[PDB]
Write a protein that binds this ligand. Structure first.
Ligand SMILES: CCCCCCCCOCCOCCOCCOCCOCCO
Ligand SMILES: CCCCCCCCOCCOCCOCCOCCOCCO
Length: 772
């Protein structure tokens, strides 16, 4: 719809980049196609489709309208065969925006290598949850999004922390707009489990080994969250929701030009949610604020400054699971799903804030440079109190553990990179080269020396959280940890033939951790990157890649000799086929993959039975492990108003014992989410549904009172969602979401410190949304 334009005659490359910007659209073009060409002048209010063909007059170009993207091509009379994965330069470094795309499949993405590529062009497993998918299913936070993410399993540590698995491993890599955070442990990492989606366009999950842009990190995957950006037209909405257990949510989002020419633009979002829960005496208020301004210093240099803020403020938090598995005599405890072991005053409050600045420049080359500066804060205030241990006792009394943790981590990041195309042997290729630095500082106080507290409660069966609050006494411990990460990286994408694209790159990493532990250091560590994509027809490509990652170990992971273990490392080997239909409106993929891990920390049973180094007292042992499995997915348009996202993933991970490991992550899982937009008389109704299933999962847990190990199983189960929206008015809609329709009762945690957690019972959410 009608946009204000001002793009004078210049190199067609520049014009296309200016167009993408002014029109809030991604423009993809082939560098050698536009190189000796110039745009014709556009001036005024114009519909973006009229506008582009007017800009291209005289250039010989054609336009492929593809939602939030256009692609430009210059056809010849000649044409000996098509080059589907030809090197394309792009106007948006983050990819295609998903907001207003109406689709559950992404456009282009840069999660893999920093190069802006389509899913078919990326030689790794890339899954995305689109803006519209979030809107349709009411996914309001990162936990809601992970639960809906093909290939991910969400399980619970406690009421205010979940765990995300992929391919056998806990995910501990998070990016924001491609900027990696420090996530060594829960210190640096408060609130990462809890981010509200109000401020984000989409969440993009790269699965396998993602050392190339993450730097030091975990195996499994990275989760990349892309922030909402300002726009050239005014727009906003307000949203109100009410759900089971007095779950109330409001949200405001406003975006647009802040000056008459449109050279400064901003976006603001505020969101607030206050809920109780099916769990007794648990509640959580969350607040989120977001502000971003874009200044055009000149038509090819842009400055962006931005801040965000999220406070997560619960009451009735637990430390570990919702209730203890065994009672005092070893019998399994049986409790309502409402049971909550946390005390009334117990709280794991968690907060995050960022300030950030970027500068982006277009070099008359077609080359583009970017500088990203981040100040990030991850704090926590955690006076925790829960029933814990083998309780009840026969008289129905039980005992509380109570500990208080406060702290804050401050991080500063600088990321600079350069990207562009280059000719080599008569063909067009592209390259990213970049360097990064992060310094991040964790400071904290801990309190376990309670003064004159009576930690017993007379009544377990009717436990309510109504116990007293202890004198925390003085701090037990001060934390001072500093982690410093330096990286340098480069990837090149060679268009070797009309059908074959070769990916060569890597990262060199420097990682120092400093503080009250003995210093931990890796210098000059190389993380390789190799992949290829081979086109088979207009529809299908096969691909293969070899990718790597490492993480220096926590300092308590020492060995026999008191030496810190070598870093936890791994390689992902992947081969697959990806399909593309309806001009990128539908994507399919099928992959086989193996993760080889090395230096996985392992207890060291034989030493640990009788320490013999006066030196250490609980040494570990560095072992190998392997993930084997395969994965199928589909996302996009099945028929004109019919959108899906679905996946199947199978895995088994074994360690150097032979024995299966990560046995809480099911060996088999499936998601299908879908919605349909009617036409004719009912074109204002959208209907929708979804199902997630997982096979058997289990844990070995030790029953102290009976002195024996036990298997705990969660049999396979299904979960079903349903959804409907009516657009009653141009400006007003109403939705209902129903979750776990069949009220399946099941576990999200069995075995975390000998405790258990239930998943959510049937719950509804009702919302209205107002678009100005
Ligand atoms: C150093 C700290 C960095 C903080 C940056 C904070 C940014 C906050 O800016 C918010 C700007 O949002 C603009 C919201 O968009 C509304 C524009 O509409 C203009 C009024 O409409 C007139 C008629 O259309
Ligand atoms: C254990 C409890 C589970 C209960 C199961 C309930 C499932 C049945 O739900 C049926 C939903 O129909 C209710 C219709 O309400 C319409 C919602 O309209 C939204 C209001 O719009 C406001 C406009 O400003």
């Amino acid at each position: 719809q009608e946009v204000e334009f001002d793009i004078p005659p210049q190199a067609l490359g520049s014009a296309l980049q200016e167009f993408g910007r002014q029109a809030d659209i991604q423009v993809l073009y082939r560098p050698e196609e536009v190189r000796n060409k110039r745009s014709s002048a556009i001036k005024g209010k114009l519909e973006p489709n009229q506008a582009i063909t007017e800009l291209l007059r005289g250039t010989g170009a054609s336009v492929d309208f593809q939602g939030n993207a256009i692609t430009i091509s210059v056809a010849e009379a000649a044409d000996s065969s098509v080059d589907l994965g030809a090197t394309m330069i792009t106007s948006n470094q983050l990819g295609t925006i998903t907001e207003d795309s109406g689709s559950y499949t992404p456009g282009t993405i840069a999660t893999a290598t920093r190069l802006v590529l389509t899913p078919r062009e990326t030689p790794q497993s890339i899954t995305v949850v689109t803006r519209q998918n979030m809107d349709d299913f009411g996914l309001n936070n990162i936990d809601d999004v992970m639960r809906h993410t093909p290939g991910i399993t969400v399980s619970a540590y406690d009421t205010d922390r979940n765990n995300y698995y992929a391919r056998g491993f806990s995910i501990n890599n998070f990016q924001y707009d491609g900027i990696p955070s420090t996530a060594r442990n829960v210190g640096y990492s408060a609130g990462n489990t809890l981010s509200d989606m109000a401020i984000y366009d989409r969440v993009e999950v790269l699965k396998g080994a993602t050392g190339l842009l993450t730097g030091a990190g975990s195996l499994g995957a990275t989760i990349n969250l892309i922030r909402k950006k300002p726009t050239h037209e005014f727009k906003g909405h307000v949203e109100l929701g009410a759900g089971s257990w007095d779950n109330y949510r409001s949200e405001l989002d406003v975006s647009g030009p802040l000056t008459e020419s449109g050279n400064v633009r901003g976006r603001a979002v505020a969101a607030y949610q206050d809920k109780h829960s099916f769990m007794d005496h648990y509640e959580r208020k969350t607040s989120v604020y977001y502000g971003i301004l874009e200044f055009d210093l000149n038509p090819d240099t842009m400055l962006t400054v931005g801040a965000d803020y999220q406070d997560n403020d619960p009451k009735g938090s637990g430390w570990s699971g919702s209730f203890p598995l065994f009672d005092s005599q070893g019998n399994r405890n049986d409790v309502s799903r409402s049971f909550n072991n946390g005390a009334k005053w117990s709280s794991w409050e968690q907060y995050t804030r960022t300030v950030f600045a970027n500068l982006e420049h277009n070099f008359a080359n077609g080359w583009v440079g970017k500088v990203q500066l981040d100040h990030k804060i991850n704090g926590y205030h955690a006076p925790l109190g829960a029933i814990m241990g083998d309780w009840p006792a026969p008289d129905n009394s039980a005992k509380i553990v109570a500990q208080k943790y406060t702290g804050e981590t401050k991080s500063n990041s600088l990321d600079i990179y350069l990207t562009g195309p280059f000719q080599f042997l008569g063909r067009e290729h592209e390259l990213v080269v970049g360097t990064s630095a992060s310094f991040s500082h964790w400071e904290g106080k801990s309190y376990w020396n309670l003064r004159n507290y009576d930690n017993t409660t007379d009544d377990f069966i009717n436990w309510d959280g109504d116990i007293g609050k202890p004198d925390w006494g003085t701090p037990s411990q001060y934390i001072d940890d500093k982690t410093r990460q330096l990286g340098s990286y480069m990837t090149a994408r060679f268009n070797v033939t009309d059908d074959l694209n070769l990916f060569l790159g890597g990262r060199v990493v420097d990682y120092r951790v400093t503080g009250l532990n003995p210093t931990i250091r890796e210098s000059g560590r190389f993380i390789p990157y190799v992949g290829a994509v081979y086109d088979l027809n207009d529809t299908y490509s096969v691909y293969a890649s070899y990718t790597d990652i490492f993480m220096p170990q926590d300092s308590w992971y020492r060995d026999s000799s008191n030496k810190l273990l070598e870093p936890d490392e791994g390689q992902n080997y992947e081969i697959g086929i990806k399909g593309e239909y309806l001009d990128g409106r539908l994507n399919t993929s099928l992959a086989y993959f193996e993760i080889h891990e090395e230096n996985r920390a392992e207890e060291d049973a034989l030493y640990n039975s009788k320490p013999t180094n006066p030196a250490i007292t609980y040494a570990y042992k560095g072992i190998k492990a392997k993930t084997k499995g395969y994965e199928a997915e589909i996302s996009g348009e099945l028929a004109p108003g019919w959108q899906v996202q679905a996946g199947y993933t199978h895995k088994i991970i074994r360690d150097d014992s032979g024995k299966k490991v990560s046995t809480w992550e099911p060996q088999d899982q499936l998601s299908l989410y879908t919605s349909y937009k009617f036409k004719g008389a009912l074109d204002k109704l959208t209907v929708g549904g979804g199902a997630r299933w997982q096979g058997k999962s289990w844990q070995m847990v030790y029953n102290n009172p009976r002195s024996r190990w036990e298997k705990f199983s969660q049999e396979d189960y299904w979960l079903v969602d349903l959804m409907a929206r009516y657009q009653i008015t141009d400006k007003l809609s109403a939705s209902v979401n129903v979750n776990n329709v069949f009220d399946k009762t099941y576990y999200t945690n069995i075995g975390f410190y000998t405790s258990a957690s239930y998943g959510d019972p049937r719950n509804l959410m009702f919302s209205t949304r107002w678009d100005f």
